[PDB]
Amino acid sequence: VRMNVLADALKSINNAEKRGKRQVLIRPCSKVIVRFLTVMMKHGYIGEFEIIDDHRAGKIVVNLTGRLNKCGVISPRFDVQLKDLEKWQNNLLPSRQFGFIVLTTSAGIMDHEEARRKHTGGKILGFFF
Template sequence: MTRMSVLATALRTLAGAERAGKRQVLLRPSSKVVVKFLQVMQKHGYIGEFELIDDHRAGKIVVNLNGRLNKCGAICPRFDCDIESF
């Protein structure tokens, strides 16, 4: 079964690990969108270094947390619509 949003899953995992007081967190699966988002977070000082691990599948990312992350998440609006609205 595929995941609906890899970015939302990664951000939820990051926020949960930060809330639990962890120093490192393993994000899987990885994607180019998640890597670019982590680079922006690192540039602004919310996370420390991160390392990409190639497992010949979807990949993993190990992120070092620095305690500056308060809350993060993806905004995924879902609206009811019918076929005529397309």
């Protein structure tokens, strides 16, 4: 069955971006999805993304601008340190001028650069470039 809705959402938006659709659909919704899509829109890979709310299971409509290449998910839920994220970004990111690493810290869902400038770290959600 389905036990990782975030991996399915990221794979669906990756497939629909690679085909070239403008508005996509995600059948689950969660806190992690909506904060991940807000940090997506803040760093500027998507546009105005919508969400429908009901009493059963909300769905998310995401506008696309084509500014994404590939957007994967670390599974299972690994943990990193501050002396460790450089090892991840050297062998995972395509470059150091772009490509971001998102991670869950004590202050919430956030990317690795402001985690480096704020000096805290934790479990890692996924990646996008």
